């Protein structure tokens, strides 16, 4: 699940969750963070996705739906959701089984689509992006929607 570039994104995603004292680390925080992950950002730009709109949509959603800790509590800073754990394991399994040894933001972006029931997967579809589109960009060439 490491790539330096990806790890940074994960760090930023958690730091953001902890800043607003969010109780959970969501697939939406993840995608939010991935918007500034070059690997991920690139695949999304090739899919003509409005990143400004997506970013706004994601931030609005996590503030309105993410439970906030009691400000007191222990410290138990942000609990990753099961969905979050799943997209990561999926990206990691895909890389491992491909014979490669690097998990990029784009690999993670692909794994998000299989999390039906996540707002993130919903927002990507809303922006006319599908798993196939990202997969086509990742492989072959810049198979872009444009």
């Amino acid at each position: 699940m490491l790539n330096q570039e990806l790890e940074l994104s994960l760090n930023m995603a958690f730091a953001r969750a902890r800043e607003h004292r969010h109780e959970f680390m969501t697939v939406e925080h993840l995608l939010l963070a991935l918007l500034s992950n070059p690997s991920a950002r690139e695949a999304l730009e090739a899919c003509s996705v409005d990143l400004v709109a997506l970013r706004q949509e994601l931030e609005a959603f996590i503030e309105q739906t993410t439970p906030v800790l009691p400000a007191s509590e222990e410290e138990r800073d942000t609990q990753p959701t099961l969905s979050f754990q799943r997209v990561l394991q999926r990206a990691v399994f895909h890389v491992q089984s491909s014979g490669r040894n690097e998990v990029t933001g784009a690999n993670v972006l692909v794994a998000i689509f299989s999390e039906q029931e996540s707002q993130a997967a919903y927002l990507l579809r809303k922006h006319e992006v599908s798993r196939l589109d990202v997969v086509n960009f990742i492989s072959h060439g810049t198979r872009k929607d444009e």
Partner: protein, 91 residues
């Protein structure tokens, strides 16, 4: 032309605590406080709701958060060895 399957935003879910005869009342009050940040004199009234009605809605979250919460609650009950059951409810 067309454009693949439907969309529909994810649905919100209800998190529920089921009643049973082996879980002690104090433990459920504990769960309501630890996993739902409920007021002492609010969790306690909610445990009564579960006992009386046999089931009680403890909150409403996104499908993603609800799923995680249900799992946290059940894992906790299990570790404390109580058949306290937490469930998911659409709509």
């Amino acid at each position: 032309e067309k454009v693949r399957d439907a969309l529909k935003p994810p649905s919100m879910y209800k998190v529920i605590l089921v009643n049973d005869d082996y879980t002690p009342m104090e433990f459920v009050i504990d769960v309501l406080q630890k996993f739902f940040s409920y007021d002492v004199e609010r969790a306690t009234q909610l445990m009564l709701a579960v006992a009386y009605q046999g089931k009680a809605i403890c909150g409403v979250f996104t499908a993603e958060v609800a799923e995680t919460k249900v799992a946290m609650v059940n894992k906790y009950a299990r570790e404390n060895e109580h058949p306290l059951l937490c469930t998911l409810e659409k709509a």
